[PDB]
Design a protein around this ligand. Sequence first.
Ligand SMILES: [Cl-]
Length: 341
Amino acid sequence: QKTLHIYNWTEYIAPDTVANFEKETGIKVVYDVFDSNEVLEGKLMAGSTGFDLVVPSAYFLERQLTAGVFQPLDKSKLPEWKNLDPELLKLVAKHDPDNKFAMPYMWATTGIGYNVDKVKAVLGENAPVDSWDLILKPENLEKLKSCGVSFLDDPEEVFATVLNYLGKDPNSTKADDYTGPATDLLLKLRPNIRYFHSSQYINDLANGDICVAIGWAGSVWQASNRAKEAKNGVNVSFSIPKEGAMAWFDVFAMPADAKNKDEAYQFLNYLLRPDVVAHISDHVFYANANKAATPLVSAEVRENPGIYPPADVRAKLFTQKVQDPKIDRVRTRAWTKVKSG
Ligand SMILES: [Cl-]
């Protein structure tokens, strides 16, 4: 019997991807899901996970290439590797030099999801939906409070977004940037924020319970699609603001103790087939990292500049850099202070 154990995010594959793979290969796939990066990182560090393929962020990969948690990918077993977009390979390479350990899977940004009609009713037809001003100017958030404002419960992404908005290095290494101006702004915004949570805003956007949220692009586009299918009239959109936004990349990686490597390479090369990953993007509303696949993606998705942004927008995106542990503890303490009154 041939088997393959995969650990991926929830709602990060097409409903029939695994079934199609099993039919084509005769491999028994055990597909498990996690809903938070803390759960994944915890298992990876403990080792002996029993997984042949896992889906970490590229950022986490850099923090583990010296630890040897993953093994290098044999490109000779991945003949369709050439389909991957070289620009995205370069960005991932900043965490995984020479792309030795990770295969780029999907990527997106952290921007603003919003209810089109409610924002325009509160702030006017000319509401600054193309700017972080929509959600980071206190005067605007005070008006939007009643219709619901949510932020991610992710200090790393939120502080980097605030720092960039203030004109500072989004990956600032100065502790006082976090405890001072970044915290000062967040505390001015806090009384207008309904909650900090990294998933509840999907359904709340789709149902009309919140009007503006900091969120992951594909999660917001999923909310927009859920609202359409519900025929409730809720019109959700997403913005990569003009001041820039954090871009991030989820990748497939192979733990060093993977027990079914041959099956894992079959699955990776399966994902490299243009129609396979294009079909996933069609369902999850995330851009994949496969350049050959882009023309096969549904027009509604590939033509959406909030999913596949053009060159001018991509040049405004920043990626997360690793920090010294002191800065990590500073961000955690400051985040608790922001959230607690
Ligand atoms: Cl990343």
